[PDB]
Amino acid sequence: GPVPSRARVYTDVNTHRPSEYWDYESHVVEWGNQDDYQLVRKLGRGKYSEVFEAINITNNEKVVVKILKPVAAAKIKREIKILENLRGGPNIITLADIVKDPVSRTPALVFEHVNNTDFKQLYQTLTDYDIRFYMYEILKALDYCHSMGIMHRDVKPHNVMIDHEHRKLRLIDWGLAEFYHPGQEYNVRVASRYFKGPELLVDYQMYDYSLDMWSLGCMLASMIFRKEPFFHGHDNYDQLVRIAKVLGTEDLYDYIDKYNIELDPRFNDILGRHSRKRWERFVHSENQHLVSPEALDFLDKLLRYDHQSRLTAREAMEHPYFYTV
Ligand SMILES: O=C(O)/C=C/c1ccc(O)cc1
Numbered sequence: 001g002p003v004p005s006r007a008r009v010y011t012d013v014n015t016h017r018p019s020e021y022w023d024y025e026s027h028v029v030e031w032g033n034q035d036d037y038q039l040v041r042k043l044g045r046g047k048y049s050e051v052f053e054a055i056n057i058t059n060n061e062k063v064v065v066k067i068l069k070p071v072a073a074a075k076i077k078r079e080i081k082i083l084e085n086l087r088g089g090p091n092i093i094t095l096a097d098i099v100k101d102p103v104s105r106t107p108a109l110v111f112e113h114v115n116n117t118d119f120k121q122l123y124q125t126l127t128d129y130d131i132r133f134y135m136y137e138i139l140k141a142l143d144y145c146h147s148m149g150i151m152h153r154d155v156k157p158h159n160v161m162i163d164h165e166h167r168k169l170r171l172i173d174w175g176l177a178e179f180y181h182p183g184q185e186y187n188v189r190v191a192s193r194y195f196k197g198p199e200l201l202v203d204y205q206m207y208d209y210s211l212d213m214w215s216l217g218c219m220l221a222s223m224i225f226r227k228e229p230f231f232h233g234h235d236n237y238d239q240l241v242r243i244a245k246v247l248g249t250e251d252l253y254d255y256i257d258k259y260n261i262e263l264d265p266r267f268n269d270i271l272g273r274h275s276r277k278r279w280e281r282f283v284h285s286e287n288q289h290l291v292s293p294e295a296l297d298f299l300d301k302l303l304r305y306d307h308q309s310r311l312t313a314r315e316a317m318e319h320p321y322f323y324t325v
Contacts, residue, residue, distance in 0.1 A: 001260065002204065002205075002206070002259050002260050002261050003258065003259045003260045004183060004206055005204075005206045005207070005208070005259065005307070005308065006182050006183070006208070007180060007182070007208035007209050007210065008308060008312065009146070009209070009312045009314070010146055010147055010149060010180070010209065011182050012182065013147065013148065013149035013180070014149040014179055014180060014181055015181070015182070017149070021085060022081075022149065022179045022181075024074075024077045024078045024080070024081035024082075024179075025074060025077055027077050027080065027081050029077075029080060029098055029107065030098070031098060031099060031100060032097040032098060032099045032110070033099065034099040034100060034101065034102060034108070036056055036057060036058050036097070036099070037054050037055070037056055037057070037063060037065055037097075037099065037108075037110060038054060038055050038057050039052050039054050039065060040052070040053045040054055040055055041053050043064070046173075048068065048069055048071050048075070048175055049066050049067060049068050049069055049175070050066070050067045050069065051064060051065070051066050051067075052064065052065040052066075052067065053113075054110075056096075056110070061113070062113035063096060063110050063111065063112070063113055064110070064111040064112075064113055064114075065108050065109070065110055065111075066108060066109040066110075066111065067101050067104050067106065067108040068104075068106045068107055068108070068109070069104075069106070070104075070106055075175065076106070076107060078177070078178070078179075079109070079174055079175050079177065080095070080098060080107075080109070082145075082150055082174045082177045082179075083095035083109070083174055085148055085150070086144065086145055086148060086150065086174070089141070089144040089145065089148070090140035090141060090144050091137050091138070091140050091141035091144075091169050091170055091171055092141055092144060092145065092170070092171060093111050093112070093114070093161070093170045093171065093172040093173075093174075094111060094112040095109060095110070095111060096110045096111060096112055097109075097110035098110070111172075112170075114161040114162075114163050114168065114170045114172075115163040115165065115166070115168075116161040116162055116163065117162060117163075117164045117165075119157040119158065119160070119162075122162060122164060123157065123222070123223060123226075123228060124226075126223060126290075127290075128289060128290050128292070128295075129324065129325070131220075131223045131224060131290060131295075132321060132322060132324055132325045133167070133325050134160075134162065134169055135216075135220060135223075135321075135322075136317065136322050136325050137169040138155075138160060138169065138171065138216060138219075139216075139313050139316055139317050140317075141169075141170075141171035142155070142171070142209075142212050142213070142216065142313040142316075143312075143313035143314050143317065145171075145177070146180075146209040146212070146312070146313055149179055149180050150177055150178070150179060150180065151177065151178055151180050151208060151209045151211060151212055152171065152174065152176070152177050152212050152215075153176040153177060153178060153190040153191055153211060153212070154173060154175070154176035154177075154190065154191050154192065154195075154215075155171075155191070155195060155212050155215035155216055155219070156191070156192050156194075156195045156215065156218075156219065157219060157222075158192075159171065159172050159173045160172070160219075176190050176191065178190075180208055180209060183206065184206070185205035185206055186205055186206075186207060187205075188200040188201075188203050188204070188205060188207075190211075191211070191215060193233060193235075193236065193239055194218060194229035194230070194231055194232065194233070194239070195214075195215040195218045195219070195229075196215075196236065196239060197210075197211045197214035197215065197307065198214070198240065198243060198252070198255065198305045198307075199211060199214075199307050201236060201237075201239055201240040201243070202240070202255075202256060202261050202263060202264075203261070203264070204259055204261055204307075207307060208307065209312070209313070210307040210308065210310045210312070211307065212313070213302055213310045213311060213312070213313065213316065214302065214303065214304075214307070214310060216302060216316075217299060217302030217303040217310075218230055218231060218303075220295075220298070220299050220302060221282075221299055221303065223290070224287065224290045224291055224295050224299065225282045225283070225287050225290075225291070226286055226287040226290065227282065227287075231243050231246070237264070237266060237267065237270065238270070240252075240267065240271070241267075241270055241271060241272070243305075244271060244272070244274050245274050245277070246276075246277050246303075247276055247277075247303065247305060248274050248275050248276030248277070249271060249272065249273050249274045250275075250276070251276060251305050251306075252271075252305055254305075255305035255306050258306065279296040279299065279300060280296070292321075294319070294320045294321040294323075295321055297319075297320070297321070298311075298316070298319045298320075298321040301316075301319075302316070
């Protein structure tokens with residue numbers, strides 16, 4: 001069957017640490033006072049939760065309350081443990097408290113407040129310098145969680161909270177985050193469609209932190225080319241076809257051959273034959289000021305089929321693209 005794969009960085013961070021750090025199931029949750037928080041307005045609902053803008057009435061400070069919908073016991077424990085392990089880390093959303101919601105009866109996570117400006121209005125405004133700056137801020141969060149044995153698995157614009165006025169950035173929603181264990185097979189049903197790495201799209205289960213780097217490359221390509229999303233698939237199968245019309249089919253077949261992966265036969269009548277496109281093909285008069293040889297070289301090293309051949313978050317911070325910043 002498929003050839004096994006290992007991360008080329010932070011491979012053994014979890015195996016050396018004690019069981020308490022990564023075994024979230026055995027984690028004991030130290031509850032806080034639900035009454036300390038007063039719900040002001042609903043900010044959004046999600047697939048697994050409802051997010052509220054709130055006020056901690058002890059210190060009169062704005063907070064964010066994330067009330068978890070009844071989904072699974074294990075997922076909830078995992079999110080708490082990952083947030084507690086990454087608390088204080090560069091650009092990681094700070095878990096201020098864990099209270100039990102009186103209505104829902106499920107736990108409600110309390111976070112610090114970040115004055116985010118809508119990505120739809122923010123992506124249409126970023127300068128070349130800002131893309132670089134914010135990309136470097138995301139990279140700090142990605143290298144920190146990866147160094148700590150954690151892969152986010154849901155990197156997208158909506159999971160990046162930007163206080164553009166204070167030039168603050170937070171990587172949020174660690175609900176899909178998982179502990180990396182070498183050789184462990186994971187669920188390919190992670191991340192949002194447009195940011196799904198080819199490993200997810202081909203059903204390759206032995207993936208790692210490099211999955212976050214492909215997702216970051218998708219975000220980069222959307223920002224520098226002013227094309228939202230960059231790879232616009234109608235479904236999970238058309239998603240792979242979208243990647244293939246840019247990266248080519250030969251490198252896709254080379255990748256599936258390397259890991260001895262069997263592609264779903266449904267791809268035979270839709271995948272076609274595609275040559276790899278040169279990046280300057282997506283450059284035009286409305287995005288050219290955001291594009292540079294450094295931007296294209298950096299993007300080219302993120303958007304690789306082979307999860308093993310992608311830049312790691314630390315190498316990505318070393319890129320000439322970040323010299324200006
Ligand atoms: O961790 C999370 O899922 C949510 C954190 C968050 C913080 C500020 C917001 O405006 C929205 C969500």
